[PDB]
Amino acid sequence: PKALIVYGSTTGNTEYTAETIARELADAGYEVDSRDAASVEAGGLFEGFDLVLLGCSTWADDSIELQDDFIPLFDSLEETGAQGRKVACFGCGDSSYEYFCGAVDAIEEKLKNLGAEIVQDGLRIDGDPRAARDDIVGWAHDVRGAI
């Protein structure tokens, strides 16, 4: 199977998380394509992928709390080929904020509205992802089991 991982990360936490998930999928036999949201074009982005994992950090704001590099993708999610696609979301945040990992909820909800198939509840990491390595690997393990 081929998996696409797209992440938006400012300080590197969601990027570390994406790389950890990418390793788990690869060690399980998937061919994985891991890309920074700052470098992708939304049009047909998901074409040909069996599984798509989208990740992003949350930044408190009055209008949109998604990480800046992910915004353009999020705004054009309807052109990616999400209908009937198996997808799962993940993201880093901090539970001292009201909207803890709120970007994960936002992305899941829009993918659901576009007809995607959410394979597993989103991975929400509090603090340093390096300290949650077991949680990432385990979630990655469960998403492969749902595909």
Ligand X SMILES: Cc1cc2nc3c(=O)[nH]c(=O)nc-3n(C[C@H](O)[C@H](O)[C@H](O)COP(=O)(O)O)c2cc1C
Q: Does 93 bind ligand X (CB under 6 A)?
A: yes
Question: Which residue has 């399980």 as its token pair?
Answer: 28
Q: How far is the CB of 48 from ligand X (least distance, A)?
A: 26
Q: Which of 4, 13, 54, 85 binds ligand X (CB under 6 A)?
A: 13
Are 36 and 2 in contact by the 8 Å Cβ rule? The answer is no
17 or 81, CB closer to ligand X? 17
Supply angle C-alpha 15, 19, 20, rounded to 5. Answer: 115
Of 30 and 99, the one with the shorter C-beta distance to ligand X is: 99
Instruction: Please list the residues that pair with 13 across neighbouring strands.
Output: none
> Which residues share a beta bridge with 88?
53
Compute the least distance from the CB of residue 60 to ligand X, in Å.
Answer: 3
Distance CA 54, CA 5 (A): 6
Q: Which amino acid is at 145?
A: G
Nearer to ligand X, 81 or 129 (CB): 129
Interacting residues toward ligand X by CB under 6 A: 9-15, 57-60, 65, 67, 92-94, 97, 99-102
